[PDB]
Design a protein around this ligand. Structure first.
Ligand SMILES: Nc1ncnc2c1ncn2[C@@H]1O[C@H](COP(=O)(O)OP(=O)(O)OP(=O)(O)O)[C@@H](O)[C@H]1O
Ligand SMILES: Nc1ncnc2c1ncn2[C@@H]1O[C@H](COP(=O)(O)OP(=O)(O)OP(=O)(O)O)[C@@H](O)[C@H]1O
Ligand SMILES: Nc1ncnc2c1ncn2[C@@H]1O[C@H](COP(=O)(O)OP(=O)(O)OP(=O)(O)O)[C@@H](O)[C@H]1O
Lengths: 579, 246, 134
């Protein structure tokens, strides 16, 4: 009895209740049975994506046999799970491998009904370099029924066929479908009591619905038969785990939140406060970014719509930031990341500055097999696969060539971006911020700091000339940043001076910032090179304050703190001595 | 039998039917056959733009082959649609796909009646720097029977032969072109029962005509067989919805 | 012998009357004969446009050899073409084709009368950074 040494009796497991029942797989089960009922091509092969119920069908078959839903032709058969030890038990002694398959392949038909062998992984047969590694026994003996049911991944099936040939001719390929959310939930309900019992917790029916629905939206890398269960089982454990540390599974408070802990996606944490998530966002973005209030609100509102998943399931929040350079076109984006991930550096910067249609897509998505270097995904695939709700920044997306813009067309509408590898990303939960300098030709007229209607249209003209409308039509909003009125500049100077303090590592020397209104005006007035935005303020500070400070530091004329005054644009502010 | 692991036996399908009727392509077929009936350079190509019947011709000749409506040379010949995995199964280890290609030609070359290959996309083999880069594996034996019918658009064709230089000295181009509007109708008519069956609807004969005329005067970027057939199929799908709606 | 696997005995095809005759091309044939008759580096190569009879010329000299219309050096010759299979049969097992090729060359030099090797498409052996050329 080789089978009693090397294999599991699947009908034993069925009779003992060790296998889960299956729902909705009845036709696929019938297909495997109908194939077994054949005299030729009697060996079905369950083919599908990993996790697509392939052995669920098999486990289901075992139950259908003991329950007599199988033609008597086949019902009288016994089912065994083989391979692995069946081979590896031997090692030394050439040919033992054949001896191991041989009595299995004899006992399988020796009076004690017909035994169907299960090779859950057909693809692991054939032979590693062929080596006549007992695989030849199968075709050789295959005429004598010896029925075998097996399974393989779609990808693996391809490999099986190409590697052996005879297997394609001997097996009946069977596609196994991924269930819909509705079907998935039915599956979950069947298994619901197993989890409730296993964990000692209850599950809300809406929770099962949520798991399947939520998984379909936030676990694109895992097929539903598993993804939905992962949320159910993980959640049940979470309940039992907390309970039994030093109840039931709630659709919202348990599963929605569980999925978010697992996958990210803050909007599914169903947070208790849109004050400490949205309100503060506008305030703090406004606190640091002066002016461009319009943009801040545009982003905050676009972000607001993602709360609870209300925003479109296939469209990233998306923006195009136009406006005067020095207006915070990328600073806002950093501050948004600064809020979203509580850290500005978590933003995925995309170096759009360097683009050619011949490299432009490949550096983002990588390439296919056969090309020097695979490590696909430089900027997008490699990040989006790990960061589902990251925020992307395209610094001068306008320099993109149509091929990239095409990637962006997908990104911005059904963002199931296909990587060079051939696998999609599905980044609909990300935030996409893009920038352009096209409006410079009109905003530099300086005729009003808040973008005027004439200016707006002229700018959008350029945008529409440059990008195809197809792109523009997929952007949540296009915002032209306001120019930095002198009003803004005074507020900004204070902010910048504080920023300088904040970034000054170990502030032994620290700024007293005795700016007084006079130096505030000095920096604000003389640094207000309106047509370059706020950026010149920095240059002014470096030129007038920091250089002198650094020198006094080098000369040790300052021990700590930092005196400030105005000595008298010719005053050059000029910081005082200290000690 | 490597060929059986990569190619589709068009002859067997034809033997079992399961093919569309082929309409008006008799001359493309005659030319294809005439070239195949040659003493040496028996390598015709179906060349034009996408959607002009290039694979229809093959189903056609497959059927002519089944019914012995071909020259002595082809009477008992068989035909296989290859490409595909023949160039990609060997995803690892140097020389692996090359071995397959060779093994296939060996299988074809020796004894087993006259076997003709059909290459759906010859440009995919191209000859990527020659130096054993797929297409380049053929020429040595293009005289040695191994008859093959190729297929490519003119852009693809021109790209291949310009870069290669030998294929245009080995293969016999056959112009394949979109049909006249009336011929288009005849085609649509031939496929009419196919669409009617799958959608469960009827197609008025005048609808076939309208689709043919319309396509000619409506979709300049799509060749008539596909263009008019899409107008028919798209319409049939719409009708099927109406049929289902009641 | 490796020559029976990775090469074609062109002399035998000529012996069997399976090759087309070369009509004239005496200057080209004579040139290849003189080169083959050299003390060292006796390796002629036919250069020209495709479609002008280069291969045919070599099959031509094979026929001259068949009928002994060549120097005694060549009268005892057997001409083989080199199949691309020497390399295209695969390089799994690194160095496999290098050995197959080294092997056939060994057999070619090794004693068995004058063996002449015809390598069609000679640029085939340029090699990716040489190396495959080996
Ligand atoms: N509205 C603002 N409030 C405070 N600081 C600002 C503001 N706008 C700009 N700055 C400062 O000036 C710089 C603005 O940088 P940013 O790159 O956004 O300019 P930019 O317009 O992006 O340049 P470009 O269009 O070439 O990316 C920042 O370094 C920031 O310190
Ligand atoms: N008589 C016919 N037989 C088969 N198909 C036909 C026929 N007439 C028109 N067609 C249409 O043409 C298609 C195949 O023919 P055609 O060669 O024009 O396409 P193709 O361009 O060869 O295909 P590919 O892009 O692979 O070259 C069929 O799928 C069908 O829609
Ligand atoms: N006596 C001859 N002189 C010239 N050409 C001949 C002669 N006999 C036959 N031919 C034919 O001339 C053609 C020229 O092709 P050949 O086989 O020589 O290839 P090629 O000329 O070397 O060019 P390639 O490098 O594309 O093989 C051949 O097809 C051959 O049949």
């Amino acid at each position: 009895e080789y089978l009693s040494k090397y294999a599991i009796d699947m009908t034993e497991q069925a009779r003992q209740g060790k296998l889960d029942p299956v729902i909705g797989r009845e036709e696929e089960i019938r297909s495997t049975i109908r194939v077994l009922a054949r005299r030729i091509k009697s060996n079905p092969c369950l083919i599908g994506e990993p996790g697509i119920g392939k052995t669920a069908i098999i486990e289901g078959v075992a139950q259908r046999i003991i329950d007599d839903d199988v033609p008597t032709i086949l019902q009288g058969a016994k089912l065994f799970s083989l391979d692995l030890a069946a081979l590896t038990a031997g090692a030394k002694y050439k040919g033992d491998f054949e001896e191991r398959f041989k009595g299995v392949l004899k006992e399988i038909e020796e009076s004690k009904t017909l035994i169907v062998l299960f090779i859950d992984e057909i693809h692991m047969l054939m032979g590693n370099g062929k080596d006549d590694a007992a695989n030849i026994l199968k075709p050789a003996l295959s005429r004598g029924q010896l029925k075998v049911i097996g399974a393989t991944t779609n990808n693996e099936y391809r490999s099986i066929v190409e590697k052996d040939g005879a297997f394609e001719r001997r097996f009946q390929k069977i596609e196994v479908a991924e269930p819909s959310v509705r079907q998935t939930v039915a599956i979950l309900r069947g298994l619901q009591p197993k989890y409730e019992i296993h964990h000692g917790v209850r599950i809300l029916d809406s929770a099962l619905v949520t798991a399947a629905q939520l998984a379909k939206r936030y676990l694109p890398y895992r097929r539903l038969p598993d993804s939905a269960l992962d949320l159910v089982d993980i959640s049940c454990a979470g309940v039992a785990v907390a309970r039994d540390s030093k109840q039931n599974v709630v659709d919202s408070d348990t599963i929605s939140e569980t999925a978010a802990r697992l996958t990210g996606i803050p909007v599914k944490k169903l947070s208790e406060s849109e004050n400490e998530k949205l309100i503060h966002m506008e305030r703090d973005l406004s606190s640091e970014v002066v002016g461009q209030m319009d943009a801040i609100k545009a982003v905050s509102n676009a972000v607001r719509l993602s709360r609870s998943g209300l925003a479109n399931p296939r469209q990233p929040a998306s923006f195009l930031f136009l406006g005067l350079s020095g207006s915070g076109k990328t600073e806002l984006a950093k501050k948004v990341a600064g809020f979203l991930f509580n850290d500005e550096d978590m933003m995925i910067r995309v170096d759009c500055s360097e683009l050619s249609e011949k490299y432009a897509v490949s550096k983002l998505l990588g390439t296919t097999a056969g090309y020097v270097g695979y490590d696909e995904g430089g900027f997008l695939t490699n990040q989006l696969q790990y960061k589902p709700y990251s925020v992307l920044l395209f610094d001068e997306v306008e320099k993109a060539h149509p091929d990239v813009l095409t990637v962006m067309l997908q990104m911005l509408d059904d963002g199931r971006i296909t990587s060079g590898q051939g696998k999609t990303i599905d980044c609909s939960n990300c935030i996409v911020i893009m920038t352009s300098n096209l409006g410079a030709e009109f905003i530099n007229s300086q005729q009003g700091s808040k973008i005027q209607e004439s200016t707006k249209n002229l700018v959008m003209g350029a945008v529409r000339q440059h990008f195809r409308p197809e792109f523009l039509n997929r952007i949540s909003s296009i915002v032209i940043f306001n120019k930095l009125s002198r009003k803004a500049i005074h507020k900004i100077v204070d902010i910048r001076l504080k920023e300088i303090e904040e970034r000054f590592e170990q502030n032994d020397k620290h700024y007293k910032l005795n700016l007084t209104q006079e130096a505030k005006d000095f920096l604000a007035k003389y640094g207000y090179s309106d047509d370059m935005g706020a950026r010149p303020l920095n240059r002014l500070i470096q030129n007038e304050i920091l250089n002198k400070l650094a020198l006094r530091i080098l000369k040790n004329e300052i021990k700590d703190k930092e005196t400030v005054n105005v000595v008298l644009e010719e005053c050059l502010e000029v910081l005082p001595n200290h000690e």
